[PDB]
Design a protein around this ligand. Structure first.
Ligand SMILES: O=C(O)c1cccc(-c2cccc(O)c2)c1
Ligand SMILES: [Cl-]
Length: 242
């Protein structure tokens, strides 16, 4: 069911880093990773939490649809793309934390906790501030747990409406061409050690789907581009994409 190939560690060590990639072949029901231990180590989800947060906001009516405009609050932040109006699509694309902090406040502690339990999401623990627990609170999730959650979303099996799941999968759209479609979300966790970057999602092919979840050490922001580049290089090496 699960295969470990330690030779794949080279994808990370060649960049003076360390990390884990987890792949799941949906047709064959088989998983692959460079490091079984780290595949099951739980980290802060950081901005990968925008996937469940979006689902909950939509299903409760906090967010009406993917066109609703969330107005900039006029506070200048250090990320230029955050200092503008957003909808669900662009808020996901630019990982706009302050928009999702407001989602969480309107959702509230009680409904957030119940929905994460219903999703079987990570350790299901929202301890901390309701508007920041995915950045510096008690919630934790592993790469293998991310895949389990993403598989439910793909199949519309999460305990929210089909509509809510379709909208979030639209907002996850990252890349598409004649050969494949990638739906995914990045994450960048800095407030609790160890600092890591995430990329989780899946690759749609004509006749199969490959789920993936990766995290890697991220001592500075200079390496953030490695999250997608390394993942895509693994996918190419395993002949999942050209
Ligand atoms: O990697 C990203 O998609 C992303 C999107 C928005 C903000 C950031 C970010 C947040 C904090 C420090 C930093 O250098 C970059 C990263
Ligand atoms: Cl789409």
């Amino acid at each position: 069911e699960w295969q470990e190939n330690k030779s794949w560690n080279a994808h990370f060590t060649e960049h003076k880093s360390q990390g884990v990639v987890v792949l799941w072949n949906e047709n064959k029901q088989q998983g692959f990773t460079n490091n079984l231990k780290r595949a099951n180590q739980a980290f802060l989800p950081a901005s990968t939490f925008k996937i469940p947060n979006s689902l909950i906001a939509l299903d409760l009516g906090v967010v009406k649809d993917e066109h609703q405009v969330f107005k900039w609050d006029g506070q200048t932040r250090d990320i230029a793309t955050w200092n503008r109006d957003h909808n669900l699509i662009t808020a996901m694309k630019y990982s706009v934390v302050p928009v999702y902090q407001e989602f969480a406040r309107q959702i509230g502690e009680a409904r957030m906790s119940k929905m994460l339990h219903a999703f079987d999401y990570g350790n299901e623990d929202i301890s901390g501030n309701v508007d920041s627990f995915w950045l510096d609170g008690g919630i934790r999730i592993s790469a293998t747990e991310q895949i389990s959650f993403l598989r439910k979303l793909y199949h519309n099996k999460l305990h929210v409406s089909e509509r809510s799941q379709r909208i979030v999968k639209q907002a996850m759209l990252t890349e598409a061409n004649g050969d494949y479609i990638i739906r995914a979300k990045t994450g960048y966790s800095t407030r609790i050690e160890p600092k890591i970057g995430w990329w989780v999602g899946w690759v749609e092919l004509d006749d199969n789907v490959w789920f993936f979840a990766m995290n890697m050490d991220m001592p500075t922001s200079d390496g953030l581009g490695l999250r997608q580049a390394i993942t895509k290089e693994v996918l190419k090496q395993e002949k999942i994409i050209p």
